[PDB]
Design a protein around this ligand. Structure first.
Ligand SMILES: N[C@@H](CCCN[P@@](N)(=O)NS(=O)(=O)O)C(=O)O
Ligand SMILES: N[C@@H](CCCN[P@@](N)(=O)NS(=O)(=O)O)C(=O)O
Ligand SMILES: N[C@@H](CCCN[P@@](N)(=O)NS(=O)(=O)O)C(=O)O
Lengths: 333, 333, 333
């Protein structure tokens, strides 16, 4: 179909060729900004940014991408608007679609963003839901490509360790499906994503020359990895009781120097969508470090996080370039 | 001019003539935007948006309107600044007035917005107070004209059912005073607006060929109505302790299909300033529904809300074009 | 020397000459805006505004200053982002430095803004920390220059009364160190600023033709004052419990007409960084009045605050012109 006037709710709504085009557009916009040759395509466009959860990267990416492109934005945060508590999403979508050219939504159930897209009458982009986080994967893939230039995604081995059933796990399944990556989801069975989704995506991944492996075996799982990726063990919005349960299950899947060693690959790089709990320099991070005896980092150690192998800030930067591409592609021709 | 640097705090501060001019400006600005011939008149202008209460429509109307007109905005929400608690309104006014070209204020007592207007030295616009919501009526009036083209306001019958002593009830009175509408406030005597304002506003409406009827009788009260309007029974900022007494006094005044049929006009349309509790798709909407046994809708039924007679979203869109007229008229020329 | 691509974290990181240049740029920018001859130098720049505390003057100064100069801003308030609770400052700094051209930070410990500066890779400006509030002094100095034309700072006597160990007391010390002001901190001993800073700053102030006097004696400290300055007795972030002890200790240092009279100078002017508790018009201002028997105001009486001698709003206005100078001086040649 293409991107013009299309929503961006999850990756599987696009073809491998579409995903690839988006990535090339992101790379091009990245270079034009860096060279002072950026051509504003969204001048005069007004964009609404709905956030029902906290955000630094996604919030800032949409803001900077919009401003660079000549657009203006309205940030509607977790509090201060009628959204959710006093007004239905169907109503919110119908009001915003009459005033804005595009709408970003970060929140809970994927069904909320789906309903918004159905009733907005303008492009709606998923800035993170409980089930999927498509723009993140766009940033991740562009980063991997830049770090293994002249290496097709189907020549790459990517390991995602930890909670494989959160939005990132699901998104990992989608990206392999459209790229042919050799995806390894290294986690305990209790944190494995939906079998039906794994089946669908593995078939598609193989079709593109890759595979999808779900294993509890760290050694076998990370062998030959080009990239090890992780994320917090309890996501935004989950009840705090999930920490005890999750840490008991996932502490052995922490990304630390031993795991980096187990890949047998001196060039392996480390990725993390962020925010990360890698030291005691955050309120909640210090809380959990003491409550669960995790000193030196949780899902990843500060050692790996700050090591030469870590490319999380290149990854974070790309969040803005890929989000700019999504808005340019869906709002201009 | 005539509007130049004039505050917009309530409708009785204007004449029928001024009202028509703003409505005409709004209509022109609406067509210019849609046709793409919008000429920015507020380039370089900086506007402060003080919000002591939640907002989706008003917040977005001021932002989009300002952006379309080349102005910039600073959103000062319920949290984050010194307003209310740490600093007097008088002080806040004199500070903002030294930095901004205009100030929108949404909050509590009308005296706050009057004090702000007193000391700001720049135009102040009321984006809702406990007593009045003038920008909403501009949108409503424009919407009605568009839906009964060619008809003058004294040729239209408008019914407002429910809590007639909230900000909307007072603003309906004001609107009738300046248009000569045949206004019917259908509500229990306990929710009737202040007699003094009714009397003042009735004399003026009649001068304009209209009238103001306050009746507890629904059947006779809605006969011949061109429009049926309603709003939530407990307004933002009112003690939650008021819901029981309100629901009991007002549930009989719910805008449902029986009320619509009672007008005897097949062309009757439904208006609601929004947000509306018309189903179980909102947090407090679902809670109050099950708490008082009101499913399928509260002040309005989902059935009427979603019917072909409902024009609430044309009405919501008009919030932006009319707020734009207000800023353009008072800041420009 | 210069400001180009330098941080602005505290005054002592600059020379008397650099400060003077900044103040002159502020006066120019102020005059240019007023004459409608302002030339935007930050067109296309994107700035992140981190606020961990509330703000009206600083928030709006940064927004208006940026808009006037063609830059855009992303307000990251006390809630809605990952800052501090979910993500460390090093991480935040490295993420924002990849997307923005400049970062403003208002919060707590000075070490937070220093780390931010160390890791951002872009200029970061201190919009207030527990220890320093440099942009405020720029506004104060410009207002003093403007109100005592053709009198060098070292020909002026400045009195700061009250809690002299908060960010404002420390900043007064720095300001006197760079200008040669005859500064008097009229405050009880328990509230005198740290010894080492007093010593370092007095030598520099003297080098510049001024002095720094700490005294518990009001009459002696305010004699011959050209300006009397004060601030709230309990600062943002400090425990509410401090009010009890602070009022008992500082009540004697309230700025009232008697203190103005004790200067022996008919032309003495009054300054206050704001917010100010000078009447009951505040939430936590009405109470503390009745609760602690403080009538007429707290750190300052309403009589003094509203008197002809008060120039607090010229001072507040200058917060914007000086913050504009800071961003222009650091982001452009
Ligand atoms: N599983 C996590 C994923 C967080 C992604 N956060 P990210 N890279 O989009 N930055 S943020 O600053 O915009 O939050 C969760 O749901 O909590
Ligand atoms: N009586 C109600 C009126 C709400 C008007 N809300 P409205 N049309 O201005 N949209 S909002 O999204 O900006 O709140 C009350 O005071 O709660
Ligand atoms: N010592 C005080 C100083 C407050 C400065 N506040 P100011 N002139 O920057 N306005 S504000 O509206 O931006 O807060 C304290 O730390 O609480």
């Amino acid at each position: 179909s293409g991107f013009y006037h299309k929503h961006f709710l999850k990756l599987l709504d696009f073809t491998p060729a579409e995903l690839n085009s988006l990535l090339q557009l992101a790379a091009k916009l990245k270079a034009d900004k860096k060279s002072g040759k950026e051509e504003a395509k969204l001048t005069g466009k007004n964009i609404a940014l709905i956030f029902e959860k906290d955000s630094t990267r996604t919030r800032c990416s949409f803001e900077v991408a919009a401003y660079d492109q000549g657009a203006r934005v309205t940030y509607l945060g977790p509090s201060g608007s009628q959204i959710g508590h006093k007004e239905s999403i169907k109503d919110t979508a119908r009001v915003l679609g009459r005033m804005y050219d595009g709408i970003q939504y970060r929140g809970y159930g994927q069904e909320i963003v789906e309903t918004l897209a159905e009733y907005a009458s303008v492009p709606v982009w998923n800035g993170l839901t409980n089930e999927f986080h498509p723009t993140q994967l766009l940033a991740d893939l562009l980063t991997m490509q830049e770090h293994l230039p002249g290496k097709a995604f189907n020549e790459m081995t990517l390991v995602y360790a930890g909670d494989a059933r959160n939005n990132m796990g699901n998104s990992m399944l989608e990206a392999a499906a459209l790229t042919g990556l050799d995806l390894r989801l290294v986690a305990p069975q209790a944190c494995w994503p939906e079998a039906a989704l794994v089946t669908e995506c593995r078939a598609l991944a193989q079709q593109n020359g890759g595979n999808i492996t779900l294993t509890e075996d760290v050694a076998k799982g990370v062998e030959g990895a080009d990239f090890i990726y992780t994320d917090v063990w309890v996501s935004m919005g989950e009840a705090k009781e999930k920490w005890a349960e999750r840490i008991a299950l996932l502490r052995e899947y922490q990304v630390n120097s031993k795991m980096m060693q187990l890949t047998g690959n001196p060039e392996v790089k480390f990725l993390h969508c962020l925010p990360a709990f890698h030291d005691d320099q955050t309120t909640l991070g210090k809380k959990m470090a003491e409550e669960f005896g995790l000193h030196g980092g949780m899902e990843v150690t500060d050692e790996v996080f700050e090591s030469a192998a870590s490319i999380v800030f290149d990854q974070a930067e790309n969040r803005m370039h890929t989000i700019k591409a999504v808005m340019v592609a869906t709002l201009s021709k």
